[PDB]
């Protein structure tokens, strides 16, 4: 027995489009799983999965180059060079209207759940982008599978993410089978021995290289199983769909 809260038409601008070194565009499912665990921390409603779809999404720039951001002189000790233009590190920006659907388990009324999600989203930040606007979130429940599809079709219109898996690698199949690659998680390289320059000193830290899976965009109504669009934190330091690989 499943419960969901849907925030439709989440207009967000200033999204850090740099998903990884080789992916620029839509934020991956690690971003929205991070947003889900962020509310698990601030609001206390513990979130299993998030199904996110893109209503609108434009990467700022041309069709072959992204619009770089005019950097500001914010480091310490480079005064005197501040009159000249700051050097640009690559961070593409994008705008996006999203539709989010969080699997939550809740025991109180739907009004306080909607208010808690609204108070989170008013202080949230989708992929480094300020949430410009969002409709009032609404609670829908998936008692059975037809009710699961009711929740699924309540995200209309949006293009959700379905996992199609890795055959050999990322570049090969992106040309061959023409699917989109995105960060489904990370791979740990080395333990980090210096916790002085970090957010926490006690949380263990690892250098990571983003693993990618290959995904497709399908409209949420054309997705047969809603579990193939709900991304959640898998126990391989990755994220994964509940329904597995989309067929």
């Amino acid at each position: 027995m499943r419960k969901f809260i849907i925030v439709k038409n989440v207009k967000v601008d200033g999204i850090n489009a740099k998903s990884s070194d080789i992916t620029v565009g839509m934020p991956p499912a690690t971003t929205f799983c991070g947003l889900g665990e962020t509310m698990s921390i601030k609001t206390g409603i513990v979130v299993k999965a998030v199904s996110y779809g893109s209503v609108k999404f434009e990467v700022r720039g041309s069709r072959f180059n992204t619009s770089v951001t005019k950097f500001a002189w914010q480091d310490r000790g480079n005064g005197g060079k501040a009159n000249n233009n700051s050097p640009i590190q690559p961070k593409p920006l994008a705008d996006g209207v999203f539709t989010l659907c969080f699997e939550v388990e809740w025991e109180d009324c739907a009004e306080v759940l909607v208010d808690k999600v609204t108070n989170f989203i008013n202080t949230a930040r989708i992929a480094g982008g300020t949430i410009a606007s969002f409709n009032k979130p609404f609670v829908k429940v998936a008692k059975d599978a037809e009710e699961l599809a009711s929740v699924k079709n309540a995200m209309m219109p949006c293009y959700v993410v379905v996992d199609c898996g890795v055959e050999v690698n990322i570049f090969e199949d992106a040309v061959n089978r023409k699917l989109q690659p995105m960060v489904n998680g990370y791979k740990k390289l080395e333990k980090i021995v210096d916790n002085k320059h970090m957010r926490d000193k006690f949380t263990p830290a690892y250098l990571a290289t983003p693993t990618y899976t290959m995904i497709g965009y399908k409209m949420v109504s054309n997705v047969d199983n809603f579990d193939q669009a709900l991304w959640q934190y898998g126990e391989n330091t990755k994220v994964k769909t509940i329904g597995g690989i989309y067929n």
Binding site: W106, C109, A110, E111, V141, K143
Partner: protein, 93 residues
């Protein structure tokens, strides 16, 4: 006259027990029609205090008092069916 209606999806998802569902039955489930004359709707006179009404209320309340010890020994299924019978007899009367 009519049963309360619960619009809440989480409440419809989770509520199972007798009181634990009944605590979710609010005034907004059909009773609260429009709500602009609430203060006049809750200023009340007490002209019921008569002979036969008070003795009837006392004898029935003490009847309940004496029998409610078997009510807690019932199961959920019993409570639901017994209260359905009580509601049916109440609309009948």
């Amino acid at each position: 006259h009519k049963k309360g209606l619960v619009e809440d999806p989480i409440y419809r998802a989770t509520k199972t027990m007798f009181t634990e569902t009944l605590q979710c039955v609010n005034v907004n489930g059909g009773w609260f029609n429009y709500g602009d004359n609430i203060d006049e709707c809750y200023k009340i006179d007490t002209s019921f205090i008569t002979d036969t009404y008070v003795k009837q209320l006392n004898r029935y309340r003490k009847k309940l008092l004496a029998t409610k010890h078997i009510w807690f020994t019932l199961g959920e299924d019993q409570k639901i069916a017994i209260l359905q019978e009580c509601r049916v007899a109440l609309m009948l009367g």
